[PDB]
Design a binder for this molecule. Structure first.
Ligand SMILES: Nc1ncnc2c1ncn2[C@@H]1O[C@H](COP(=O)(O)OP(=O)(O)O)[C@@H](O)[C@H]1O
Ligand SMILES: Nc1ncnc2c1ncn2[C@@H]1O[C@H](COP(=O)(O)OP(=O)(O)O)[C@@H](O)[C@H]1O
Ligand SMILES: Nc1ncnc2c1ncn2[C@@H]1O[C@H](COP(=O)(O)OP(=O)(O)O)[C@@H](O)[C@H]1O
Ligand SMILES: Nc1ncnc2c1ncn2[C@@H]1O[C@H](COP(=O)(O)OP(=O)(O)O)[C@@H](O)[C@H]1O
Ligand SMILES: [Mg+2]
Ligand SMILES: [Mg+2]
Ligand SMILES: [Mg+2]
Ligand SMILES: [Mg+2]
Lengths: 372, 372, 372, 372
């Protein structure tokens, strides 16, 4: 009993490590694959399920499926299987040796935090566990206690305003347009170039196109009229089969969906008017200290030039007599885990766990009252 | 009950032996001969049928006929007769002593695998038998689990892609241009030299011309224009009657039919565009690992310089940023049997037989569900 | 200038006629044939290309090729040749006399609609033309403005939800399993009966087997176990050479691929879970009016008993408190053209053309903004 | 330069005439005779070689020899001598006045068409010449462009399928059982009556027996059992020396060799299974139009009742749901020349000659590329 596990179960990518380190020892996607062909070799019951890095190598013959949809775990027969791969096959530690700090998104169903709690005790038998909130932990990474958290992950995007210690739950604006629904819009606009990426194996190619050749336009129409002279923007990507694709104005139209959700047909507003409408529901005296502290996190805020368009477009919405400072640390991808490393290494937290003894006599409703 | 028979009934040449050896103990062609003349000696009912090595010695007075057409057994009164010659007269073992591993081509009719099964139990009374696939067994010989199998035998040629354990049945491209239909094109282009090889006895001479003086051109037109100066290429063959033939540009035009099936008038493409079109129907993530593993087998890939023209012409079709590696072992003629020796000598296979007891209560549809 | 041409260039069968009629005056397949043999008669340069009904009569000596793959035109040297056969040799009208209403599939590449537009002006010099969408025009035939369109043609199958005027482009689920890829599965399951249909000339025989003896099972396993007593289902077809085939359980396994795309190995779902997953991405208030309006069209919805299995299997997926009404008109094969006859005969459309004058000053990007 | 010569050099009988006529002006056998006795008169060097009609009158003292064996010219010192008799002594025209249309059998050696070409220019100095194929020219006589040609001449018999313009070279079934090898079987079955016809002078008597008293049985065994009551079939022939022969069942057993090549010991099948096996190698879509067009030609199809047994025995081999129509014109002996008269009298052919000027700069390989 020395250190604690921090198993950030993201909606698209599991991050796990130890309390204290500044880099997780387990980065692999939340993929549980099933083979779908015949299998004529002598390995009949040989590796019926591939999890994580296994199902990323062998993905041409596997029916991949993300077990987590918008932060809501849909398949408990598979999310147990990633955790069994997480502790034994990748971290190589016993679950019974160390406590665990699980993370989840805010506004999740109340049956979701309980079913995570039921598994970590009745299956893995951990000593103690605490389920934090992913938007709280972005402050501990940046070293603040004040700000609003644009936590655009892979399954969900949600602004959470937090003033000096005190979170404001009546102003969380959740949005279900995230990195998984940008891939599905990118596969719909690569069809107009002729390239047909359809199945789940090609879905992991388009996600790799999105992480390499896709930026955010500062102004959208003037980058659109630049694509009329289609020579200075068409970058080329080299597929796993050796083919090439000449992708042009699809470089910037796929992350513009974060600012124009009418492209994929969502009746809401982008991440510049769900931040501005989450500050205009806070109190007027703390409205000045939230403009100067705009913490971003998540994978979907790793695009080139997303801190420019946030600062350019909130300023068009804010009253123009004071400043907007988008605070984007250059390692903000892992920032939910980095704050999870710090908070599990404090002194004022080692009494805030939930032990097995406390879980017995108080039941699974002891986890919802733990700081909401 | 110690070892197992592996009776590879090829479409033109029966290979039989024991499980464990690296060379079959029975190599003789699938020929059942009938005499066609009068027979004035006292041997009236003396040896009315000659099978295999018998009908290769006495072939001047016999009406030879292959019982197997394109892998499909056409005459069950003769294919029983080769097997009765196989077990007793050549292997000299009882059929009831050892199990049997029969091989057959993929995409054969479903009545063909059943009628082989009916004979091996109700006539020879073997303990157990398993009908494998000839394209699977080329991997066990080469020691791989990944690749596409150019299995150009004597009756049929078929590319079968197999990734790491899992075969892809929706991409098998079968082709009925094989070594038997190259003999019939060679007898049609020896007519233009004047030499008339017509009957079935001379058909076994032309097959012996094809196995000795016929190579594959690397480039076809530049070897054709070389034949204008007709002195440096005309090799001579010495017939069984002592005659000679001065064969020239017919050295390379008969195996060019494997790459130009429009010579014998087939509306398909050669073995370079049925391999390339069998990879372009596989999934895109396994398309890279099939280019680097091109297993060849069968007798018709024993020509001089066939690994050159495959590697030279798939490369003209593949995207030119990555490599093609034609894997041609120097004993690939027997490679269907060599893999049959290994697979019958495993530990994870000795439960995968089909016994007589299991065949009784489950009927002849128990053999089609056995790994397709 | 009285009427308009409606040239529905299908992926497998060209339909052309006049605006106003209820039956097209030109039904012939999209086939451009090249002869592949010697041609020893005096007709040396005599009819080097046969198009449509010509290449259906003489198909034994022709290398037929469909110019259109999945709605995407692959060979512009041949698609011009069908149109030159369409206007002059079959409709017998000048192209310069009447405007033209071309149709195409949704989610086609943006270079495909432009290259059709470039040919109809710069080669045939038509007065005006409009490129509609084939899924829109299925509503005008059925006389509705509300519904989802199962447009299972020959090259492509795509559900398009359309509410009262307003199409929903963020819910089109395209699928590349159509009538051409059912023929290729039927030629792979006639091999297990022994019958080898391989070349392109026999491909037009198997397509004629599919249109006559192939129905859809209501329940699949109970029609499969019916084939164990193989006497009451084996229908016979009489080939062009006078042979017969006794086809059994291949009557219903070839259109079951429309509901089980894992048979030909596609990692997607059938046309019952791409309709249900295209309604579950529409808004919840219009989800009730799409269940009661399920327009089918295309050739591949002409099977016996396809309206039964759609209504039987969406009902297993829908919430079971309200109704599903599959609307299948008994002439739904030509329904893309029937709606094209009506829409070219309206009053509110005769200003929605694209003239040659408007095409000059605005360029080929004037056709993509025309109602998407 | 008005008309053209058509010198059909048959394997047993030279036919020559002019382009336009419906009957050749030169019918005489291909016989070059040498005298073999002493010659005691004063005519020492008097007529050392007799050609054609000369060596048919004086044949009792001449060693006759056919210069052509199975279409292959064996003695160029004699085939020049027939042509020198053909142009000057029988047609009485200069060779330099008119072009020439030579005919030959298909599948002849490539040295045979060149050596004919070398003689017609470098010895006779004709203006232009074209070497056609004898099986093509049977269609022009019958006025068709579709059918299979049973061209049973004197040296060779070969089925050639020809569809609408386009010949199919991969289905020509050549057979070396023809009218010359029926004479040699007739001289072997007249020995059992006692009559010994042995030398070449008596060989021209047996050929005259075959052309007068030999028919084809419709059913063979029932005409054989009719010969048990040997009174109603034994016809009598009157020899040149005044003797008579009472020939019985040898009337029909000598042309039965055309349907039973095992009588003279050939390992092949008759002219009913080399026509049926030459249609079963054609494509399946043209297999119906070859059954209804069975053109016969050549001298060996002049027997009484050969159109009956072809139509009676292909029908036993064909699928019995459609018809067989043996098309036998009543002048089919000269039909190779009749088609040669028409094709040399066309307008689309007078550019398809091969002049002396074109032969100089292009060499003797210009004749093989001329429509194969
Ligand atoms: N460098 C990048 N640029 C753009 N998008 C990225 C990048 N890296 C990851 N992403 C997107 O973000 C997702 C990963 O975000 P992450 O924060 O790991 O999700 P989660 O909230 O589930 O942990 C990926 O699915 C990918 O689509
Ligand atoms: N050395 C050789 N070179 C070229 N071709 C060969 C050679 N040996 C055999 N063949 C051809 O390969 C055929 C034998 O192939 P094989 O693999 O025995 O066929 P099967 O699949 O029926 O066993 C023979 O008919 C012959 O035409
Ligand atoms: N009666 C039928 N039953 C089943 N399938 C049919 C029938 N008629 C046509 N088909 C299939 O539908 C295809 C024709 O569809 P069609 O509507 O012409 O496609 P498109 O017009 O989109 O190219 C044919 O290729 C055939 O496979
Ligand atoms: N009336 C006849 N009946 C049967 N056979 C005949 C008849 N006339 C000729 N023949 C045979 O046909 C041969 C002539 O065939 P022909 O077509 O002249 O040969 P080629 O094809 O070499 O010109 C003769 O050798 C003779 O044996
Ligand atoms: Mg995350
Ligand atoms: Mg083999
Ligand atoms: Mg259509
Ligand atoms: Mg002739």
């Amino acid at each position: 009993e020395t250190t604690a596990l921090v198993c950030d179960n993201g909606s698209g990518l599991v991050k796990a490590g130890f309390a204290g380190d500044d880099a997780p020892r387990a980065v692999f996607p939340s993929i549980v694959g099933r083979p779908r062909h015949q299998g004529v070799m002598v390995g009949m019951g040989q590796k019926d399920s591939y999890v994580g890095d296994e199902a990323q190598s062998k993905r041409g013959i596997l029916t991949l499926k993300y077990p987590i949809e918008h932060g809501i775990i849909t398949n408990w027969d598979d999310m147990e299987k990633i955790w069994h791969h997480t502790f034994y096959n990748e971290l190589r530690v016993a679950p019974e040796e160390h406590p665990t700090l699980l993370t989840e998104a805010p506004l999740n169903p109340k049956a979701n935090r309980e079913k995570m709690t039921q598994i970590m005790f009745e299956t893995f038998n951990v000593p103690a566990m605490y389920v934090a909130i992913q938007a709280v932990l972005s402050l501990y990474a940046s070293g603040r206690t004040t700000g609003i958290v644009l936590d655009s992950g892979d399954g969900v995007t949600h602004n959470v305003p937090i003033y000096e210690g005190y979170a404001l739950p009546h102003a969380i604006m959740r949005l279900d347009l995230a990195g998984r629904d940008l891939t599905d819009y990118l596969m719909k606009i690569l069809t107009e170039r002729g390239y047909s990426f359809v199945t789940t194996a090609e879905r992991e190619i388009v996600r790799d196109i999105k992480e390499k050749l896709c930026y955010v336009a500062l102004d959208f129409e003037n980058e659109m009229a630049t694509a009329a002279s289609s020579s200075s923007l068409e970058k080329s990507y080299e597929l796993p089969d050796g083919q090439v694709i000449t992708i042009g104005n699809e470089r910037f139209r796929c992350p513009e969906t974060l600012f124009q959700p009418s492209f994929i047909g969502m009746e809401s507003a982008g991440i510049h008017e769900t931040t501005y409408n989450s500050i205009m529901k806070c109190d007027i005296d703390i409205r000045k200290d939230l403009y100067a502290n705009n913490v971003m996190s998540g994978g979907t805020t790793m695009y080139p030039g997303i801190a420019d368009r946030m600062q350019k477009e909130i300023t068009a919405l804010a009253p123009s007599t004071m400043k907007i400072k988008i605070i984007a640390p250059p390692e903000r991808k892992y920032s939910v885990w980095i704050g999870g490393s710090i908070l599990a290494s404090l002194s004022t937290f080692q009494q805030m766990w939930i032990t097995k003894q406390e879980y017995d006599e108080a039941g699974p409703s002891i986890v919802h009252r733990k700081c909401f």
